[PDB]
Design a protein around this nucleic acid. Sequence first.
RNA 1: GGUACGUACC
RNA 2: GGUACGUACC
Length: 668
Amino acid sequence: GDLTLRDYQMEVAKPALNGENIIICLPTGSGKTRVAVYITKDHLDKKRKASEQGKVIVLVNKVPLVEQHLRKEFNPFLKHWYQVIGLSGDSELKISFPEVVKRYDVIICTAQILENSLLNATEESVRLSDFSLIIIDQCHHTQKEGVYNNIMRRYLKEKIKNRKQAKELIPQPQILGLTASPGVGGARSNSKAEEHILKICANLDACRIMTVKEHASQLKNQVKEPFKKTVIADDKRRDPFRERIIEIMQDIQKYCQLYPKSEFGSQPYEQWVIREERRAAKEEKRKERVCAEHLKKYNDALQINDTIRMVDAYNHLNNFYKELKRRKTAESDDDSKQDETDEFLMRLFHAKKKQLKELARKPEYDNEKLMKLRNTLMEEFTKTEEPRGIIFTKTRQSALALYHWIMDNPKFEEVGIKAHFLIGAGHNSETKPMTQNEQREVIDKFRGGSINLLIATTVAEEGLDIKECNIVIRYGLVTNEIAMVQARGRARADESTYALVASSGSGAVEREDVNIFRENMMYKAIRRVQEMPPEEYLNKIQDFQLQSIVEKQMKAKRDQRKTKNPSLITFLCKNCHKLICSGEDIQVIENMHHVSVKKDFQHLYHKRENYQTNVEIICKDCGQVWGNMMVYRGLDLPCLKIRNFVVAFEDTKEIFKKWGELPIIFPD
RNA sequence: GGUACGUACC
RNA sequence: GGUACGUACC
Ligand SMILES: Nc1ncnc2c1ncn2[C@@H]1O[C@H](COP(=O)(O)OP(=O)(O)O)[C@@H](O)[C@H]1O
Ligand SMILES: [Mg+2]
Ligand SMILES: [Zn+2]
C-alpha cells in the first residue's frame, strides 16, 4: 502492499508534492526510491483530476537500476493505473524513443537514451517539455560534463528562452534530484564546500535542498550506522622479496643506462619508465625501450608485493616471461626474434627465478596488511551465525589475487567463508573483465548465501542492490567522501562494522581523515544553504546557472578546433622499427575496428594464441604484438591496435593510444 | 570503439 | 593538460 510514506520521507517529499523543484538528501537504506514513486503517483493523479497531460521520466546511471526500480518500486504501485516501461541501450527495442514517449506515462531509462533523442544526430523529436516531471537518481553526478548535467543544461537554456517569449510560453518539467550525499567536489575549505552545494542546486534548478530534521530520531532508528575502525600496519617486517627485485631492477638499469629520479615501486617511477618506453620507441632505441618495458613489469611486482602476497608478484613476472617465450619462439605453421637485450633479460630472470619462487613460499615475509585483513575477517565471520561482508580494493588484479589468497588457505573455508571476486565490465584494464551477467549472478548468489564475501573494486560502492553486510573493509582503498559514505552504507546489518585496513606508509589513513573532514563540511554547507535567505540563494543560483551555460560554449569551441587525410602517414613497429603499412592501406569496420588491406601483408606477421578471435598478430622480425585476427563477412582480417606502432610522417615520429587521436579520417 | 565521472601521481 | 588505476554509459 500500500503506497504510503514514513514521516521522515513525507517531510522531504512535501515541497515536491506542491510542484517545487528540489533535491532530496536521504541516507542509504532510507527508501529514496519509494519517495520517488509516491511523488510520481501523486503528480500523475493530480494531472488526471485536472484533465491534463501527465508524464514522468526517471533517469538512472547504471543499466541494472532500470530493471531494479521497476521490480521493487515502480511496477507494484503504478502498473495497474498507468503505462510503465523500463528502457536501456542493452535492450534492442523495435520501437523508437519518440513513440515510447507517446505510448507510456512512466519511462525509466538510462540518461543517454534521453540525450540521444534530444541531440538526434540522425534526423518530430523528443523535448524536455514533453515530460511534466523529471526524476534524476543519484543526482550528485549532475555535474561538469556528465550526461545528467547536459540534460539539465538544455533545461536551463529552455528556461532562459521562456522569459524571451513572455516579453516576446513553452512548458517546463518539474525536477526532482535524489541522493545520499551531494558531495563537496574535492574542496578543502568550507567556502568551496558551500560553493559546490550551490552548484549542484544550480544544476538541478532546485528551489531548495531537502534533508530530514523534524523526524531525525525516526530516521536514525531506521538506518543504524556501523562502528568505525582503522586497522593500521606499520610494516617493519624485513622484505627480502622487495630487496632482491630491486637488485634485478638495478642490474637492468646499468645495462640500458636508464636511471630514475624516483624510488623503486612508486608511482613516479611508473610514470618515468612509461615515458622512457615511449621516447625510446620514437627514437629507434630498441635496447632502452625493451628494458624499460621489463623494468615496468618488475616495478609492478614491487607494488603488488606492497598490497598482496609476493606469490602474485612472482606470477606477474613469471607470466610475462611465459608470454615472451611464446612470441619469440619460432613455432610451426609460420610462412631471429631474440635480440641481445631479449636474451640478457630472459637469462637474468631465469638465473634469479629459483630464489624468488622459493622465497615467495615463506608467509612470514608476506605483507602485514594481509594478517590485519585475516585477523579482521576471522573475528568478524565468527561473530554472527549468518554473516556477510565486502572487501573494497583498488585494482582488478588485487581483487582476483585476494580471492585466491582466501581459497588457498583452508582456515577461511573452515570458519565458513565462501569468497568470490567482483569487478568492472569495461575492457580498458590489463586484467580481463566480468560481464554484466556474471556481475548479476555473483550479487544474486551473495543474497542467496552461496557466496559469503565479495572482493570488490569500486563496482560495489554505488547504486546496485547488495545484501546487508556485517563487515565492510576498505583494503587500502580511499577515494572520495561520497564513496566513503556509500561504502559505510553497505554495512547496515545488526552489529555491523566499517574498517580501513592500510599501511601507515601509504598515506591512505590521512586521506580518509580529510574525507571525514569533507563529510562534516558537507553537512555544515547544506545547513548554510538551507538557512540562506531566498534573495541571496536565488542570485547565487542564477550566477552558477549562467556561468555553467558559458562552460559548455567554451568546451564546444575547444572541440571545434580539432575538427586531415589518409596516406600522409606510415606505420613503423615500435620494437624493431620495420616498415609495415602506409596510411592508404588502413580501412575501418563499423567505424571502430581498424584493419590492414595490403595484398602481401601476411608475410610480415605470425599468428599465436594467448573481440572476434583469440589469435594474436605478432611481428615476424621481433615478435611484438600488433593486435589480433578477426572474421568479418567470412574474411580473415588483421585488426591492428594503434598502441603497438610508431607512426611516421612526411614533414616527425609519434605514438598514439587511440585511433581517434590521429588527425586522419579512414575509409569504410 | 566513442564518451563521461572518480582517485592518485606529475 | 598529461600518465596510470578504477568505474560507468552509449
Ligand atoms: N514507506 C515505506 N513503507 C514500507 N516499506 C518501505 C518504505 N520505504 C522503503 N521501504 C522498503 O525499504 C526498501 C528500501 O531500501 P533501499 O533500496 O536500500 O533504500 P535506498 O535506495 O534509499 O538505499 C524497499 O525494499 C522498500 O520496500
Ligand atoms: Mg532504494
Ligand atoms: Zn618488429
